[PDB]
Amino acid sequence: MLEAKFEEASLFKRIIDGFKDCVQLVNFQCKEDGIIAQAVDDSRVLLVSLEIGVEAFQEYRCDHPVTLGMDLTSLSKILRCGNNTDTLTLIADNTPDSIILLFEDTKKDRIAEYSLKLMDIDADFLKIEELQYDSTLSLPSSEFSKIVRDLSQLSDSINIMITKETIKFVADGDIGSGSVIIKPFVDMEHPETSIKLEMDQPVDLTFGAKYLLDIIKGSSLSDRVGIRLSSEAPALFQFDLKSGFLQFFLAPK
Amino acid sequence: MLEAKFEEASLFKRIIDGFKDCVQLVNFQCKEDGIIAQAVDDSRVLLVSLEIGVEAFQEYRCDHPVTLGMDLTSLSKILRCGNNTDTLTLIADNTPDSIILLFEDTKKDRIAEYSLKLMDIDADFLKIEELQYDSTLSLPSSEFSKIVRDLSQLSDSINIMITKETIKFVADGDIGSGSVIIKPFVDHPETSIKLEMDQPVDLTFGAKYLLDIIKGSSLSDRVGIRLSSEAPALFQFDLKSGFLQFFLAPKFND
Amino acid sequence: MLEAKFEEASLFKRIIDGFKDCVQLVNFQCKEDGIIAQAVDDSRVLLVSLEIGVEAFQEYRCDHPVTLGMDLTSLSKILRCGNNTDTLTLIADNTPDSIILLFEDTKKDRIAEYSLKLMDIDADFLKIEELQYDSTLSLPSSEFSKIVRDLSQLSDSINIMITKETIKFVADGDIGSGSVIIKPFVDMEHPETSIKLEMDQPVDLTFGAKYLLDIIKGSSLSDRVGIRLSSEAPALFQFDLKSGFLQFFLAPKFN
Amino acid sequence: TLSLQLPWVEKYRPQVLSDIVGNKETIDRLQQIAKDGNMPHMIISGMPGIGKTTSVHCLAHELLGRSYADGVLELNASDDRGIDVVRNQIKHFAQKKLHLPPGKHKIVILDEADSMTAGAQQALRRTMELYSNSTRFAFACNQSNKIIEPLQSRCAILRYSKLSDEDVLKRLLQIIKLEDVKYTNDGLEAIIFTAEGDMRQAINNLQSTVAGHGLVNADNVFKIVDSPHPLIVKKMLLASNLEDSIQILRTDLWKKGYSSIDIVTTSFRVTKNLAQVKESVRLEMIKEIGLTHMRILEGVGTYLQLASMLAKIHKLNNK
Amino acid sequence: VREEDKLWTVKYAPTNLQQVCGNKGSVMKLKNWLANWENSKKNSFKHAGKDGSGVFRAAMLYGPPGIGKTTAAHLVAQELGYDILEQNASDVRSKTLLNAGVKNALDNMSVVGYFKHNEEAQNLNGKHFVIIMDEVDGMSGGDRGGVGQLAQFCRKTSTPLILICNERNLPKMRPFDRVCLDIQFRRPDANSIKSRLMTIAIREKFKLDPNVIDRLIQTTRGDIRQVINLLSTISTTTKTINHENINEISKAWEKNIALKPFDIAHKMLDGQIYSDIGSRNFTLNDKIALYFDDFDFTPLMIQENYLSTRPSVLKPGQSHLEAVAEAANCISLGDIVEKKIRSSEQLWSLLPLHAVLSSVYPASKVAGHMAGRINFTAWLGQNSKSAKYYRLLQEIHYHTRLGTSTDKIGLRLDYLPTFRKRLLDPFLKQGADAISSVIEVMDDYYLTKEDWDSIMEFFVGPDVTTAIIKKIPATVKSGFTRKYNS
DNA sequence: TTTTTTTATGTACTCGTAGTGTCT
DNA sequence: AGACACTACGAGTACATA
Ligand SMILES: Nc1ncnc2c1ncn2[C@@H]1O[C@H](COP(=O)(O)OP(=O)(O)OP(O)(O)=S)[C@@H](O)[C@H]1O
Ligand SMILES: Nc1ncnc2c1ncn2[C@@H]1O[C@H](COP(=O)(O)OP(=O)(O)OP(O)(O)=S)[C@@H](O)[C@H]1O
Ligand SMILES: [Mg+2]
Ligand SMILES: [Mg+2]
């Protein structure tokens, strides 16, 4: 029934690499309008929400909302068979017991087949709230991963401040202090690297370092990331490549 | 005495790197014809043979067929220090207690002489017999290596099915299964697949041993695979003057 | 008030990485002529002496001699917080405490302000060693590091022998033995690959493998390293930078 | 000052099995073994400073001749001797090829064998069993009970005993003759008395007295080296009247700077190793000493606690 | 290789099964077990046979070291045509690579048995393997060591599995209790080792008399390897051995092995040791070393079986009850010392004192003859049961906290004697129509069916509900279980 | 005849994700 | 530019303690 012919195995590889060490066993809910994946860690601070539409596939077809449970480690184990010149084709039937993955190469003499056994997991309800966020910023994903991994060295608590149209990332450790200051920049020659900032009221929150370290793992999906800060609601971290996107909802202390 | 001069030390380096993750102690018998080395696995499942002829050395010298017991880990440690553009010379004196390795540079006179202490390998020399094989095929070593690397991630058992001129590599593990189908296509004329199939053969090997065998996928471009229903399969990497063979025994065909 | 501004911010990173493993705490003396640093290993087997003149600092202002005692496992973390096309700024008040690092990007507008708490190291480090050596050689840093890393796998002691136009590095262990012998030549086509050697009397002494492996970590600074050996004297492994040098005084093992 | 001289324990360290004045039986055994060859696996146990490491060193040297450098593998407690070392280095040395005379074998000396972990000791069994025709193992320890029984089953057991007065006196006389030192009978007697069968400690005290005063006399030896700690404690516990024991504890132990923990530990050890009094009274004295030690360890260690301990011991001895 | 280069134990090693000394029954049993192995695999080990060997696919040899377990195993392996393979703790043995190798070798054939000789009519078994594991008790405790991995290996294999260890009944070796056929090699008889020593002495021109091997093997405690090493060590200097120098030889070669916590209890409670004569032979230092051999089970065993002996060291005017009371007082003092030791500040330097107060003094107080049997300490099982009951009571208390508002002990002591009358008593006096009342009472305090089952196990004495629940009609119990499951 | 007993730092092993120099 | 052998530092798991 479910037959989805991927554009390239590397795309699904990256979309799975985005959240390797975040969750283990999850339930992909697949419908006709797209595929949604909701995951909640044990510490109850991040909410992994992955949405991939039909326009992200070279061919996607389905006629029944179904559920596919699986582990992420075995998923990456099957994806490790992928190459750079083969496409992935996902096959699922009316009785969900095993997903069939066909690795097809342009040369029709070498075709690969693999199988993934499903596990049953208690799925969680979708969190798609649009509660108003105080400030909204957009920063290149590589630079954000760099600054996060740099500030994680000093202290395990990263302070984000949005004041006087100046973004401040502070990390006061025991050996010293850390303070990276950035200003809103708009670039006209390279429209992928820019510091976009829209502020309505000053923001000042604290976040866990390992949480941001787990979030920045999705930097391989997109060239830039959108971070929405709010003083009364979980902050949003949004990656988007061309049409499929991933979101982390971090509940601040 | 013995003084064997190589062309490039990288050749011997790759030779040792090929079969150094399966066996540890190897007996190198040097005779007037060349070097012959047979080594049984610690689990006695995979036997490794290696022949290097006299026409593979820049200069060969031998007054008596002499056995040298070598540990492949220390040998790899010694050979790792050399570069790609040196001449390697193995030297052994009377009453062999150690082997000398001369690395001589070609654009300079910098000589690096290393010593390697021999070991006491109380192992019996056995005889290898060639017999008829029901199927004999050849295919690029890198492709077989990637098939093994893809299938070993599910289970440790690899089922080989040669039937109706089709190669079927099956991996039945805990999380699903994996299947690879191969049809012989003879076209570059060098990356072709030459296959002769007489009897449809069904064997089962260990994925770890397959990985240890494909780790030597740097001595040639293709692999010579010879199957047998009641005899251990022969995986061969051909050389300019010798070969590296693995006699891997199949599992119980109950 | 100490105020220094580097031309490239990665030079300080490469310099500190040299001491990162072989030295724990440092005490930078900053004067009007440049920054000096002398440190002793925990086991007190090697002595690190770094000197960087005001030629390296794009800007320099030292009102009075300043002493900055600090830790290297934190300074390296602060330096890795920078960027490849950034500039580094060291600031210290009139009384030395809580040194400030400023990373400023030259392509975009970015300010990274980091702090480092100083430490009160009672042991002074002002000793200078200026004595003639029995042999002075100079060889490419990569060629020396290769031999060191190749002979460190054989044993834990590496013996250096200097004879009449012959440099020998011997290593005898349990799995075998080895010896690399080189001759001093003059290379006209490339000067950075030549090997020079001026000897007064033959030398023969051994070092440990760990300290010799830690020393060659500074090979990423200069393309050529000098080695000064003498009869029972701290061997001088020197990497000369375009504004100063880094010299390791290594102590041999008694036989 | 620029350099020091070698101590007499290291300078006059025996290099031939005849120079050892230890246990005559085991010494002649090892001498005949080195003369004939075929050295078996051995474990030498005893007390510190009686000639265990020197004995095995002399045996290995005499048995290997010039091949000592490449045929003997020395591993002390200062080096890593875990499971990984036994797996890699010891096995590589035992498997190493070496042309030796038809009466010699490669020797693996393991000093302080009582400190090796259980995993390494277990792995050493087959390591010494499969290469018992070209590699031999000699362990030197202080407690043979710390070595597992499977390892002890594959080797000979040599238990070294304390050195009698005559042997240490003869060795000290030889050292004095070789060093031209002025001495006297009472000085040597005091040295041997303070040595307590410890040859290394005896030679060290002799050298220290020589370098500190020049003349080896009982007065000098007593002023530079105090009397043995357990003997004064024994005389204090074996006192018949309470006032005598109290005066001994005050003058000899408390007024000289001996900590209360050391005093109570020495009292416990002496009462444990005592043989003058019966078993029940010894157990009661040990009970009281432990009751006192429980207060000494809690930080209440003073002279009053030791005085009360002595008073309770005397009350127990007071029928 | 020459003759004088091997030890006497190697040149006199058994070359066939007819030269093994003692334990003939064990070697014959293992030989029959290995012979019928293919007869056992052809019917999938369902038929055990008259010998009882054939249902287990693995054999575990356990006994003291140096009696010939490995030797006999290798001998039968070479004699029955099985291709031998050995791996032990001297090689790397972990959960990662050892498991992979052994799994790949359980149902793979041998290339050595194929290439060596496979054309003659020797046996169809040469293609098979025998995985002989030595020093099984030397592996790591946890699962990463591979003891449980090997225990699972002994369940699914197509090749005979041979396990050889020196210490069998250990916690680490618990998984091997019901998976492999156990064979115990015991102390060899004196006649066979006597003949072997006669032969090895007449061969080496060693003068030796038959009167000494008895005391020799007695002090050696059944170890032929140690005996051979002893003769090889002393024969070089003393050419003739007899009843004159045997005392020094026995005193110098005494096997100093730690006793199990059962022999320690026997030696501690032995009245002859504390006599005026035995005191100066087995000194107090040896008595403390006895406890230090195993300082974890000795005090528990002493406290368990100190009042189960007949004392022979009773002072004039003292009864058995007085000595037992003093021993129990010293036991309590030693317990206080042990609590001070195994608590904060780590006062381990008080371990010798705990030797005297806990074990030495109470045993000396009641030393004598053993009336019955040396019973194992029940304090371990009682502590485990008490911990389980405390966990269950904690769950019950945290379930009922919303209504009870009391402590754990306050709920166990007073609330349960009423919960019993509320829950279970309406079942005995009303039948099956009182189920709704019990359900309401349990939901009033958020009780569960498992909680109801655990509640009835706390009462003791005249209230033992273990038979009361059986006296309840099964219809009422089934109705209650079905009602609570809806 | 048969298996657990707290906390406390030192010791030893292993798997283990990770950071970086090297090879088709 | 990239893939993967080599590797060293970090969490886990037990094991003694006179
Ligand atoms: N029998 C002896 N004859 C002569 N000198 C001896 C004798 N025993 C010991 N010594 C001296 O003591 C020094 C050290 O002896 P060792 O053998 O190291 O002591 P030990 O018996 O091994 O006890 P350890 O090492 O503390 S376990 C030697 O270098 C000699 O100077
Ligand atoms: N019953 C026996 N008869 C004759 N010699 C024996 C006997 N048992 C042991 N030996 C000797 O002891 C040597 C070692 O025997 P092993 O079987 O290795 O000892 P073990 O019983 O396996 O105990 P280990 O190895 O410590 S687990 C043999 O080579 C023989 O020389
Ligand atoms: Mg010693
Ligand atoms: Mg054995």
Side-chain angles (χ1 to χ4, degrees), chain D residues 118-132:
Chain D
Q121 288 186 338
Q122 196 75 212
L124 207 52
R125 299 170 50 176
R126 205 78 170 213
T127 299
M128 83 190 310
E129 200 72 343
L130 308 172
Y131 316 115
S132 157

Side-chain angles (χ1 to χ4, degrees), chain B residues 176-216:
Chain B
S177 200
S179 150
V180 175
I181 179 57
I182 308 90
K183 210 52 190 163
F185 181 25
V186 185
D187 53 89
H188 311 336
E190 286 48 50
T191 176
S192 63
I193 299 194
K194 285 172 45 47
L195 197 169
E196 318 170 20
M197 196 299 298
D198 292 18
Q199 320 297 134
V201 175
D202 181 28
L203 314 181
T204 41
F205 302 120
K208 184 213 51 193
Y209 296 112
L210 293 194
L211 286 167
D212 265 348
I213 288 166
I214 64 110
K215 212 142 172 163

